[PDB]
Amino acid sequence: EVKLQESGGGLVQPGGSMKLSCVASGFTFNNYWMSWVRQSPEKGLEWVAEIRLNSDNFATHYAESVKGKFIISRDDSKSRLYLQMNSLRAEDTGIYYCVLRPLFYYAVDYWGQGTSVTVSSAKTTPPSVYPLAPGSAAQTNSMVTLGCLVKGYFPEPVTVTWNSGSLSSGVHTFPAVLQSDLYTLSSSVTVPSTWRPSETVTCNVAHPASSTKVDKKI
Amino acid sequence: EVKLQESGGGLVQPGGSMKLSCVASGFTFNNYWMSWVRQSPEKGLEWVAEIRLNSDNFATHYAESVKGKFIISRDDSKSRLYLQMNSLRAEDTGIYYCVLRPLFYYAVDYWGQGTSVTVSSAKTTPPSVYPLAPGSAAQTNSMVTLGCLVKGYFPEPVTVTWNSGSLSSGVHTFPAVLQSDLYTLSSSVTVPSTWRPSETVTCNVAHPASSTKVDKKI
Amino acid sequence: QIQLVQSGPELKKPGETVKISCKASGYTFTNYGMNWVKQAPGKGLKWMAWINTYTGEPTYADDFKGRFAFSLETSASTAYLQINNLKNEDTATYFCARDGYYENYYAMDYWGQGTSVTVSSAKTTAPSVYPLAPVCGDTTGSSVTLGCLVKGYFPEPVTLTWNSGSLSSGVHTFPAVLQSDLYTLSSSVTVTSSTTPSQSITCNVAHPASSTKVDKKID
Amino acid sequence: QIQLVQSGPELKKPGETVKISCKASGYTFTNYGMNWVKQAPGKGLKWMAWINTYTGEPTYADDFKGRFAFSLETSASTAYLQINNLKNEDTATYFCARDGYYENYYAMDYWGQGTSVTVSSAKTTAPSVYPLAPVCGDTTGSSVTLGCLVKGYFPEPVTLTWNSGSLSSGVHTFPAVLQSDLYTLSSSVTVTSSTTPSQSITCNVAHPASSTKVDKKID
């Protein structure tokens, strides 16, 4: 019905510039409203800007957190929304989502997935992917656990998977943690009881700052 | 040993001025540090300013939330601390506490109770104290519950008690709630099973904007 | 250019079922919502239901959630109200109003003409139209007043026009009356004092029983 | 004006107990903390404990939490270390250092002189002081060098001064030596080549066994 694909997140210098898009597929309303919402544990979920096309009308609106730093635009001919955020500060980091709803009293809004936006002086550091494998030790429960470490990478987005999505059962990707301006994490797979672990069971890690990886084992 | 009594909280116009004190009783250290910490669900507990007298030295320090709005002073001869906060905005509302600790590697800090600070255009409205009493209805469990309503008052501090602290068992003072720029609450007492409720069982309510009260019942 | 046109009037015996359409035009049926309102005779306006013309999801007022089916046919930009097991109360004029957003809130901007659903067992029986000339009373001085009388008909909607567009003069069409499940109505037209009787004034009568009697009045 | 003065040296037989004080002066004993450090002979500095002179609460390093009681007497601005059931290792020079805050962190700004706790069963036995003149060797050319020899004493701290303040010259006091649980030390003083022997050079010897022998050297 409606499908929302957004893109444009990344790492930028404080005081720098950012621009986020959002394409509304199969969204044929002439009268609706489009909003941008952001999220971060420093402040939870918070509204930033809203544009609204009610017959003859483009009425945009903003808050404290953005009055003068961000601006909303809306012109493909009829599909894309544009959040131009510049003069970005350190507290603008979060994941941004476009939310949409046609002008109906009763209506469900549509949300995209979001793109992370990281604001820092820290440059991009690629992830170092280390394969995990027991020896004799981990013969604990009856099953087979082996993992994959992901060292000090910088901007937070990331995609650790296994066999490119083949074996998606018994997986545990942990949240990233932060030691000194750098992130780290690990994924875990517990493949079938017997001794078929370590070969042709691949650890693929994706990190957007042009560094993709497929790693092996014991 | 050490005893910290602070005072000076209240309601002030945004853009207005406030000054909070704190008296350190039996605090005979020559080298220590004094800090001001604030709290509010809009942001939790957060540090604002710190003064420190290390032999020959008064080194004050502040953050984002106050750089230029608040200033620390310290001069009775040797007892009081002064937070001069002016140009107060709407987000400076919270309860402020002075925290203290002598310059020792290992040391417990001392904290005061705090004074509420409310920043608004809303003027002070006194509380309306209404006595609660059943009839035949509330003969539910075997005991005797009767209460006391506290209507639309403004600045939040308040002290609802019973018989001036005589009967302090089975009391339930609920948190204040906010309907349109005004607060409301109720206290509950469950006096001894039999029929001795409603007389010489008094509801005393204290509200700092010069309105104290002692109310009766059925 | 924007207008909401409904179904024609309907007569239905109690217990029966009816479906009334409300078509859109001049605008896109799927970008704004729709309400169904009801007005009992003499009585007032009562909100029935609301519907999102996009998901086809209605919200009925409690008094109408039962034997009331509010549907829609998007392609043709029309909504429909279904009424099952009609009853005495089911007689009323039913209205579709478009929901519009204005200043943070909604209002029903464009309403439809209305629909008369009349429930009765009384058979449809076509009217007699009688031209009323004043002759032999010389009611000639100031101005002249002629009249039409339409007797015995059912249901209530009849269209009484004079010369189809003489109405600019003082036409007075009096509401019908119900006696023994029949209907009676009459119109009066006041024409140019001493000047029009030399030109034909006709009484035009249309009634949805395919009856159409245009009875001229000589004298 | 600020100085930390400790107890005098102590000799204690193994198993016994000792209490060493460390008094403050020139400043207020209760506004800064205190550490007790230890230095085994020849060996290095090891942190023992730390104490808040205000609550009287100490934090011992693990190797010292047992038969070690770090107390304090605030009125008189003095701290104390208690040592129970002394042992071979308990011989060392023990130090009190004041904890100071400087630039966000702590450091031991003012240290005390040290204390020698020597554990032995060997009885205190007072020294013989022998003046060493060079006579009948005419060691006269450039300069002259005389010497003192203090033989057989216990414990190790002896104070060897020359004329109490001749030290500005080349005094060389050599560390004592331990043979058959007795002690031997000697000092040398080099005086004005061909000029001072016409003035008395004396060897002053103080030893905490109330012995005090000031042995002049003629010749």
Added chain:
Amino acid sequence: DIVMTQSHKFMSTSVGDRVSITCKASQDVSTAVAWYQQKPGQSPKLLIYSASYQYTGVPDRFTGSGSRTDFTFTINSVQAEDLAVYYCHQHYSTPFTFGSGTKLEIKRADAAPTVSIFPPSSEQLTSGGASVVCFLNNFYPKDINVKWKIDGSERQNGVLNSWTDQDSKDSTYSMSSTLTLTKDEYERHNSYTCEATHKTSTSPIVKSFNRNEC
């Protein structure tokens, strides 16, 4: 549900005057209130949306006030056309409660009615009926005592009256009065009188006729 109660159901006001209509909500509905106006026969039009903003086409005459529980609509200077039932409507919570309405009865200067008595049509009597009708046009006040009289005294049964609501062009009422006899009863009588007894003349308007042939 949330009750919308309109202060006064009937409201009478003279042309050029001011009349404010009050309307109360049982629970705060904020400014989400709209005023619709309904002229007789035709369908209701939106006048004031969001409790204070006029809709397109509506004049600066029509105004509104309102906030949480209390709302008003004021036509500053009434006209002969502003005859209708004005309803208020909440559009906040689920059941969109409506108010009862308020009809405006414009007060005006008295007027005697033009009267016309009509003898039964030729075509009608051949078919069996004999309906004599009387139009009492353009009068004021509303009550009129119509009264017939056949061959002497009055006839009470056989009649059936009908009215129009205040005429929007001069604020005047009008009425039809029909008596129905059967061709038989009719040929047994010669004189017929339409008797309009009414307020603006201590003496009645009388229109009549008796069986002639024209």
Added chain:
Amino acid sequence: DIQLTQSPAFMAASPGEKVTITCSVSSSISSSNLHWYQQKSETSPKPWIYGTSNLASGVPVRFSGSGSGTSYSLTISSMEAEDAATYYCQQWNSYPYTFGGGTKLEIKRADAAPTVSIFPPSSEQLTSGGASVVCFLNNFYPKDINVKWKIDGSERQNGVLNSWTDQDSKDSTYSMSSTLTLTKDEYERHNSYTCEATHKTSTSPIVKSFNRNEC
């Protein structure tokens, strides 16, 4: 800014269980400069543990801290009444002295049915024509309860002001308050005032009611 992350922020423990809550720090910091605090229902924060291991005072020995550089934790031998509260970890090493989020501490108990109590508006209130129906759902456990107001067998929620309390430190129970605030017109035009409550203890909603004796 130095980010102090506490875990968990949410916890329920069997009375008597050894509870442990952590506090992770972004950059290393000295042990002497990490304090902890306990904040009961609605008082002031009490410093609980200074240094990283020193109980403040009147702090029972059941409590204890441990950690270094980046990791720290607070343990309680056996969880009890007076321990239910919110715990924060500070940081007095670098500026700005940030505090860490919080850990909410719920102590478990044996279920308890509530003590409902219905009250009619004060005649002294109705002076002003204002009438608010009050109800107290006292001493219950767990905190999960649904409170319905009924006027003449009708459910109303417009104008209902509920307020809860935290776990009492003596017996770990709750209390709720629900006030129907209305006018003497809407009020005096109805009779049956009911306070119904659906709690996990009876599949029979507790009802407290009174039929009005007004003017």
Added chain:
Amino acid sequence: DIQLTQSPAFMAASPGEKVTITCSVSSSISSSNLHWYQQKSETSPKPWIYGTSNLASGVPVRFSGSGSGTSYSLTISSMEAEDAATYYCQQWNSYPYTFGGGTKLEIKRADAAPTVSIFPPSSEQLTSGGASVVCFLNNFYPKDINVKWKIDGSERQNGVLNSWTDQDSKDSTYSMSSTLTLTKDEYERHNSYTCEATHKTSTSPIVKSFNRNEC
């Protein structure tokens, strides 16, 4: 600003219990403009209920909202696996569109002992002379667990990076990760690497260990 207060912010419910969470608003607002959202572990918020009563989609009928003006609530007939998450209530009536805090939803279960797993640093890691010992305390319940690192019978906490997960939506269990990050000097100068874990299921700390085969 329009303050949306949710209650509780913290909740644990017996699987199958009828759960109810509230959302109080500061000023009255229209029912059509209050949406709810569900945010599982680490995805995106899914609109859950629009209007105040309309389930979004793929939203099971167990779910339902109700309210008006100032009060609103979200009920779930019977609490289940796929329901454990965080719930927020929005406000698209007035600007600024504020969101309400949150309600954390813990679903209960029958206790489960963890599946510890110890791992030695990758030879490919030790290239750089960096060696981090990894340990996984998998599939356990409850979330309360104490994880100790031991090097040659010594407990170390400097440099230990733990990371937890939320309740799995299939079986409501947890998982933790603990990484001892160290250098090839401090590392290669010690042998016994132990991963001990004190959980509510055994009064015998689970130990996983390995004695080093380095260079």
Added chain:
Amino acid sequence: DIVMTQSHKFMSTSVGDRVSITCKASQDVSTAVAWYQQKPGQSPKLLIYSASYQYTGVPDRFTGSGSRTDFTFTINSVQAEDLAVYYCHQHYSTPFTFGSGTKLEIKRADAAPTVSIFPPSSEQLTSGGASVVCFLNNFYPKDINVKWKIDGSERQNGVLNSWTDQDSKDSTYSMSSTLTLTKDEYERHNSYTCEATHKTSTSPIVKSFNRNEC
């Protein structure tokens, strides 16, 4: 606990030169590191506190660097006085771990020792002992082969040597050598030689005497 390891225990450096002392922490201790200096006999003084800030009284000669795991102390131009053991100390976590220290052995130009042989004191021999002592003063390098010779060949037992650490005013060593006979053994011998064999002279310094009476 947290191990503080000092790179080099002994450090030799010539006057006017530069020597940097490294010191490593086992776990990040941030800048909470202090350097103390200990001259022989007397107690240790604070030099560099907080890993980079000089303490009062200390000169601009003494410097420090350091951050998390690696710290340094540099005396830009050494002097005859800077002879001691320099220790680093962490004051972050509970057990305040100390480093081993680093003694500075200032390299300098060779020097033969002034020699003095002393015959036993009158008072001493009456009491029973007969201690002959020899002072080998102000030499460099450190090793010296002291050797006695009585009435011909050398005596090996009876002796007991003693040294001072590098003299702080000229960086020179010094030593005492005492031989102890009993009044008896002593009156049986007439000639006594103090024999300083040592690096800066291919041929030995010899001081002697034989039983005279003065």
